[PDB]
Paper text:
To understand the provenance and biology of baculo-like viruses, we have determined the structure of the nucleocapsid in the intact BV of the prototypical baculovirus, Autographa californica multiple nucleopolyhedrovirus (AcMNPV). Using cryo–electron microscopy, we show that the nucleocapsid forms a covalently cross-linked helical tube protecting a highly compacted 134-kilobase pair DNA genome. The ends of the tube are sealed by the base and cap substructures, which share a 126-subunit hub but differ in components that promote actin tail–mediated propulsion and nuclear entry of the nucleocapsid, respectively. The nucleocapsid orchestrates key steps in the infection cycle including the packaging of the genome, membrane envelopment, actin tail–driven trafficking within the cells, and breach of the nuclear pore upon genome delivery.
The building blocks of the tube are flat, diamond-shaped dimers formed by two triangular MCP subunits. The fold of the MCP is novel and has no identifiable homolog in the Protein Data Bank (PDB) and AlphaFold databases of predicted structures. The MCP face exposed to the outside of the tube is composed of a helical domain and a four-stranded β sheet. Unexpectedly, each strand is held together through a small interdimer interface burying only 660 Å2. Similarly, interfaces between the nucleocapsid strands are relatively small but stabilized by a potential interstrand disulfide bond. The lasso forms an antiparallel β sheet interaction with the lasso from the next strand (right inset), whereas the zinc finger extensions from two neighboring subunits project toward another, burying only 483 Å2 but potentially locked-in by a disulfide bond between Cys29 residues (right inset). The baculovirus adopts a stabilization strategy analogous to the HK97 chain mail, which is based on an extensive network of intermolecular disulfide bonds that covalently cross-link the entire body of the nucleocapsid. The intrastrand cysteines are conserved across the viral family, whereas the interstrand cysteine pair is specific of alphabaculoviruses. Thus, the entire tube is a covalently interlinked container, which is expected to be extremely stable under oxidizing conditions. Thus, the MCP dimers form quasi-equivalent contacts in a manner analogous to icosahedral particles that follow the Caspar and Klug principles.
Residue numbers in the entry:
A (entry chain C), B (entry chain A), D (entry chain O): 15 to 26, 35 to 253, 262 to 320
C (entry chain M): 15 to 253, 262 to 320
The structure:
């Protein structure tokens, strides 16, 4: 079925994770390519050897990158600047306009293809098929659609200042302006700092690794320098690369046995309040509204 | 050769990684048993694939544990209260008193066992063998030895307020009161938040997971609730486990393919300033004092 | 013969036998008195030959060096051959071997440091046997190289046929400059190293000016032989086990296969940046054709 | 294919690089013979052993030449004086008038051939074959055509005073007036002093060996004396060569091993800007207009 938003890309690369019903509705290949994220899972173990897996993502922004280059999911206002849509294929640009609820851009995309001779020669069929698949996925991920199955069990607040009072701050207000698909992406990628299951409160990370502002979900720590994150044909791209000159064969030989702690930067931000009457363990992806 | 300080425990259990020349000079089994840490490695990757490994430890204290239960490596003042040395074997008490450079307790331990009938034969030899092994390990880890290969190469500060100015805080001056073995343990367990290799500064974690206090190495976050870390045959104990009640097989099957991000809480604290001229990649484990 | 100033390198302690990492080109009597590998290691350069063709095919070949420092390097890292004042700071002599410290302290004529070097080793028991001979052999080889290079030797082959100036403001009038007066402060070996490593902008064989390069790629300053351009950003120059040092490597992500295959048989212009600086007047009665090394003082 | 410009020369010798589609459209022999330049590759490297072949062109003007003898690519105004194109065969003169877009010269050439007895009998088939071939090659090099496969990702400014501000100057203003083929030749031959790929700027040579003025791309250096560059049948030459009378036959043996730095004067002038989106590594000869 290939439940990925960028699956319907054809002239007018999906990873095998698209077939899985994870709820992301995007594959890790496309996630890395577009939103500078790599999907992971957060095994929230119990004291007893029982567990439940919560989706998480690691941002792929380097330490030296600054400014717009640190934005993972831009807002609807500035998604044209971050993504450089004109470089992408017209199908990708149409899908991105749909994802960010840009009706005018979608209309312009449709209009510029009308002047083509072949638009009615099976090209309109392709455009409408891509649009229909993308809109079906969006409606699947949108709680506001007609007769939409929605879950009110989990309250997700991206501002922990007053989260325990069952209310959010400015960050959660900006989160509501997002589309349903982007809200789902941020909910899945950004695992909460605090997960309050019933009365119990669990804290996974000391402080946030990302911030939501007018520029969207930004892969920047709230204070201080940014964390050290180590990471198209016929395109000349030049990147500054940190390199260690020393020989490290003997060090890896000595420290081989011990378990390795990843140097990735997982996306942690906000508060999650799972209600006592929750169905959080279902595997059907009922979209969640805060 | 079992290079574990607690491998000499004998009446008057070491993991296989003790034999490895990791530099901890303590096995993972004994680290878990005594200091509430499990040895790990931190693979520091380039922007290329070349990597070098640093040793870190993940503390095993719970969310609900408060007070002395959160101390990982207690100070010389309060290590008596934290460890409850009476329960463990007298050889273990001798090793601990040698670790904390408490001469009066060592002398009392020697005096108490002098009155036994078997002290002269097959006991004093054992106590002196334990003493010699512990003292050799201490001298290996002590930079103030007669001819010690001390290293001014890496400047490891445990306070980042004035660390960039090559100064230290209160925690750093409290760190110097520790013995050679304890200083080596804290260096090999408490990873640096920042690793300023030459001019380049690499921030490994946004916030510190532990703080050095008057009570010792405390596994307490600087602010907010403590992080969620889920973890004597005849002794009766109560754990108050936080059981998770629900069916998670379906969810675990759904999210199987994706890489698992560990839920462990590692020890990140302080600032490491590696000098331009360094011999970091050696595996000889020279004391490496500040 | 291995006429490399660092070919005398050896571990003073006889327990460790340290072979000299010396390039095969050191045995040549070119006049560098330093091997390619040692000039790559210290005094960051690569020994090159600059063939100055005549108008016809017959040619005479000069020696020049290309500084290996990068674009991003600033401050001390820019200096290739430091001045005698700050050569200790630039080189970090503590990390180097004792033979290297001795050679470098002799190169800059720092007698106090050399006396200190032998004072530190005078205390050990092994100094009397199998180490005094080693230190004296290193000193003798370095002193012989310096004296061969020194124009102030007892009977030196000092040659005034070719005049080499390092300031071009008034070099046509055979007058020196601030950089040249700083150049005279260097010892003989450093002067020859700079002369063989730096080529003039305006060669002036007889009265025939021969401008090698438009603008200088190096400047002699108070800090030393600086690999810094006179103005603007620095030139783009692409470029010890158990040591962990950052690199900041710049990487190209393109395919480059089709572009490389496109231009197959076209002579490749090098990207190397050689040291061009000064004004080497040559007299009508010169003897530049000779192959025997000479100090070549002003 | 013989894509060279003067390949079609018959009455109304190219080095085997005419068949190669390197985008030059003129053989190295024909470049030397016509424009006093040469074909050489400038392999811009990086810290990693990788490269992309950008093309350079040494100029063949000697040290002592003055005035119009130093010009490599004269302007459309004074190409009659600089080139003495009349002396060449009428095919070469016609193709040169084609290159500089002089319709009066071309149709005067046509008028002269009309009165010949052979024009109506198998001569127009030659002159218009030459005209059509050369106009086709020019249009392939000309960016502004009906169907323009132009690339606007890169920007070339031959004036560096305000080049970093994405503007040009007098030199670039006089540069735009050139023909498509002439602009292509100046672009390919003259490598930029500064190559700003994305945000990182690379400087290859300190000073501009060639200066653009009204007389054309002049080999003269902007300051000081000219650089030292050592290099028609039945026409004896009053030619002056340099007198190096030394032996210089064993000194080469003393310096045979080392690598030889070429004494060729390359063609450096101006500042080239490349954006993040670029297709430089393609071999389709994007006309690359400004
Ligand atoms: Zn996909
Ligand atoms: Zn053990
Ligand atoms: Zn050598």
């Amino acid at each position: 079925v290939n439940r990925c938003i960028f699956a319907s890309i054809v002239s007018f690369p999906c990873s095998p994770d698209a077939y899985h019903d994870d709820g992301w509705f995007i594959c890790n290949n496309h996630l890395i390519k577009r939103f500078k994220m790599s999907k992971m899972v957060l095994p929230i173990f119990d004291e007893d050897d029982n567990q439940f897996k919560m989706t998480i993502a690691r941002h792929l922004v380097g330490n030296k990158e600054r400014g717009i280059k640190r934005i993972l999911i831009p807002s609807a206002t500035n998604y044209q600047d971050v993504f450089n849509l004109n470089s992408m294929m017209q199908a990708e640009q149409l899908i991105f306009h749909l994802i960010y609820n840009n009706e005018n851009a979608v209309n312009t995309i449709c209009d510029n293809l009308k002047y083509t001779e072949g638009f009615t020669s099976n090209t309109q069929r392709v455009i409408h098929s891509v649009y229909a698949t993308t809109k079906s996925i969006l409606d699947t991920t949108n709680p506001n659609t007609f007769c939409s199955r929605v879950s009110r069990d989990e309250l997700r607040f991206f501002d922990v200042t007053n989260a325990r009072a069952l209310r959010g701050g400015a960050g959660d207000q900006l989160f509501n302006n997002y589309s349903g698909f982007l809200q789902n992406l941020i909910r899945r990628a950004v695992a909460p700092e605090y997960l309050q299951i019933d009365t119990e409160e669990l804290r996974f990370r000391n402080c946030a690794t990302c911030i939501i502002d007018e520029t969207g979900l930004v892969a920047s720590v709230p204070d201080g320098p940014e964390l050290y994150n180590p990471i198209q044909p016929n395109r000349l791209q030049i990147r500054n690369v940190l390199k260690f000159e020393g020989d490290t064969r003997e060090l890896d030989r000595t420290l081989s046995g011990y378990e390795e702690y990843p140097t990735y930067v997982p996306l942690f931000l906000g508060y999650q309040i799972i209600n006592s009457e929750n169905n959080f363990l279902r595997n059907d992806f009922i979209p969640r509204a805060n």
